[PDB]
């Protein structure tokens, strides 16, 4: 297979364009001078995530490819936003499919899904990630951070903002290098040498809750807990898993390019065996997907679908396997928020493990027939693509060659898809691989009104972003382990458009100014996932030859339709069609 190296980065609270124009384009522009690169593709998403895939000529040494990529990325790192740099950028040389899933459940229902995920993140994932052959490890859930859930009513009552909160956290959750008594070079006759210990990271919600934000003129104290709820909770809330319908987390493990499948899996089990004796009570490992006695089901809903609606679809999938197929299926491990493609609120995946072969006699109880029957049962689910598969027609990129921009490229894409649909004798299921534009809330900050009021634009933008998007402030120590601190609005003050107006910013003169005084807003459409191909804006189109036609005939026709598109729109073949 051509080896591929993946760069991943994140920007908390960023929309797709923001990610693309501050991160993705910057990396791409700097991926020069790397040997044997066949092509590069990227997605920039409204989850705040970018993935850049660099695919190398067959025969390329994946180690050299990875090192060359990492080194260019290193020279580009100072060009990226500080918020992106501080999340950690990763570079992996991995297969894109899973080798295995390590599930973790709590048999005594002592621990919620969130607890279990933190336990895995904080106690298991690093040692697995260091096991030789392990290319990529996905946590099905999130590590805890310290979560400061801000209340805008209480902030405004005390004439405070998220900026004051972030400032206080950085000042009061600090790890200070303070020197030594009797330090070198010392005076003659010194008797005592001892470290000076000053501020140290906080370790608990109790300690965060008593951060001192201010002292009122009257002498009363405003503590962080007087304007926020303080709790441990995920760095993010996007991925939730279940094992046979019960709360779970786990690790999805991808094989390092060129490593040995069987050796790596055994190294993994051996590492798990070291951890088990120290689990808290109730906690237990399950094995829901070991790579013909397994398969996957993909769930892909339209952009716009929420966590609740993806979950309803996954509940249908899971139910089918635990009822209609309960004689063949041993388990289902289902993940809401991550799928084939990676991360989104509109996607899911179910890993299905079958009973022993010898106990599924009959060709109707073998994987091929089970997957076919499942796809057929799920083919009627509304506004979802749901199918079961183990783990070919064409792979086309439409390309913006002339700075046309997203809206025009979408119109060209639609023109091509309409033309393709008039040739059903030659092309079947010609479709975009990506996502459709969805409504977004465009808010305009009035620079004039802000200046007239003495309200700083940086205080406005921090207030907006930190409250509605979240902001990674600094690190703390949870039960001995370095983890993140995040500030964000408590959920109920960031749900609806009118909530924008309840957030106040402090002017230079000390007055509190509501957001409504200096902003206006409207609905518009934009992209939840912007694609690029060899550094240019792109839209991936999949399809296949119609029955009784060669792939090459299907491709020749696509090329002909492509030659009639608006000026500045090109194309290229990738993946299986390269």
């Amino acid at each position: 297979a051509p080896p591929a190296v993946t760069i991943s980065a994140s920007y908390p609270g960023a929309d797709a364009k923001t990610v693309q124009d501050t991160v993705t384009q910057v990396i791409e522009q700097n991926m020069n001078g790397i040997d044997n690169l066949m092509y590069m593709s990227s997605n920039s998403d409204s989850t705040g995530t970018v993935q850049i895939t660099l695919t190398f000529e067959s025969g390329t040494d994946a180690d050299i490819a990875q090192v060359q990529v990492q080194n260019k990325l290193q020279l580009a790192m100072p060009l990226l936003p500080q918020e992106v740099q501080q999340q950690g950028v990763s570079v992996e040389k991995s297969s894109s499919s899973f080798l295995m899933v390590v599930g973790v459940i709590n048999t005594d229902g002592t621990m919620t899904q969130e607890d279990i995920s933190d336990y895995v993140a904080a106690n298991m994932k690093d040692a697995i990630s260091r096991t030789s052959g392990v290319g990529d490890v996905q946590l099905f859930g999130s590590q805890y951070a310290m979560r400061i859930w801000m209340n805008p009513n209480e902030l405004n009552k005390f004439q405070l903002t998220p900026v004051d909160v972030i400032t206080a956290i950085k000042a009061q959750n600090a790890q200070v290098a303070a020197g030594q008594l009797g330090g070198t070079p010392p005076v003659k006759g010194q008797q005592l040498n001892a470290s000076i210990i000053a501020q140290t990271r906080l370790t608990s919600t109790e300690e965060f809750g008593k951060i001192l934000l201010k002292v009122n003129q009257d002498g009363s104290r405003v503590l962080l807990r007087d304007v926020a709820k303080i709790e441990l909770g995920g760095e993010n809330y996007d991925i939730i898993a279940e094992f046979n319908g019960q709360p779970a987390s786990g690790l999805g493990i991808k094989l390092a390019t060129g490593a040995n499948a069987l050796d790596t899996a055994a190294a993994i089990r051996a590492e798990l065996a070291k951890m088990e004796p120290f689990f808290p009570s109730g906690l237990k490992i399950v094995y829901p997907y070991d790579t013909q006695g397994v398969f996957m089901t993909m769930v892909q809903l339209p952009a716009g679908a929420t966590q609740e609606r993806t979950q309803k679809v996954l509940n249908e999938v899971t139910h089918y396997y635990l009822t209609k197929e309960k004689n063949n299926v041993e388990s289902v491990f289902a993940v809401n928020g991550f799928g084939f493609a990676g991360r989104g609120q509109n996607t899911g995946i179910a890993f299905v493990s079958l009973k022993d072969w010898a106990d599924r006699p009959g060709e109707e109880n073998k994987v091929e027939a089970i997957t076919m029957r499942a796809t057929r049962a799920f083919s009627q689910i509304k506004d979802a693509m749901v199918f079961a598969f183990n783990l070919t027609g064409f792979d086309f990129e439409l390309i913006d060659q002339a700075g046309l921009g997203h809206e025009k490229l979408t119109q060209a894409r639609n023109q091509l898809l309409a033309e393709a649909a008039k040739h059903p004798d030659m092309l079947t299921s010609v479709r975009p691989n990506g996502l459709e534009d969805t409504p977004q809330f465009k808010i305009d900050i009035d620079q004039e009104k802000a200046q007239a009021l003495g309200v700083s634009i940086n205080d406005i933008n921090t207030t907006l972003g930190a409250a509605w998007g979240g902001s990674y402030v600094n690190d703390f120590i949870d039960r001995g382990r370095v983890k993140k601190v995040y500030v964000m609005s408590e959920a109920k003050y960031r749900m609806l458009p009118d909530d924008i107006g309840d957030w106040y910013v402090r002017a230079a003169d000390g007055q509190m100014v509501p957001f409504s005084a200096f902003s206006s807003s409207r609905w518009e459409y934009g992209s939840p996932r912007l694609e690029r191909y060899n550094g240019l804006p792109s839209m991936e189109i999949l399809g296949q030859a119609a029955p009784g036609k060669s792939t090459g005939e299907a491709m020749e026709l696509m090329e002909q339709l492509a030659s009639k598109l608006p000026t500045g729109v090109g194309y290229d073949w990738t993946g299986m069609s390269y």
Partner: protein, 161 residues
Amino acid sequence: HHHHHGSDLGKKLLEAARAGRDDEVRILMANGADVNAADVVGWTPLHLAAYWGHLEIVEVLLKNGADVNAYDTLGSTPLHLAAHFGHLEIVEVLLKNGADVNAKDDNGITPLHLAANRGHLEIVEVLLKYGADVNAQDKFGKTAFDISINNGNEDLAEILQ
């Protein structure tokens, strides 16, 4: 004018109006689809057609009783969208069918403000032709003329006088 959100033919109509599927729009209307079904942001099929430039769907919807002055959840109308996005023929059809030329959204913004800001001069002329208040002020006190000065658009300033 704030139409409530939810149904199966309504949803198909919202999607068809958005994608420009003229035939399907026609079929759905004949099968009783609510012409003013709204999505979660208050957009009706007329909003969608106007935003995305689908003239013939705009005409079909109005002929079947679409609320020409439908408001989204921030007070914006199909005329706002068509004026903002440069859809001249749509602007004319809407105003011809009783669109409120001086409708203000929640920010006090009118269709003339939007057309002015993007420099869509033929739209500006048509709106003024239909009675647009040339001196209407948004929440910040700004007129179309103030917009033309801030943007440095001399042609627009000329039209406004």
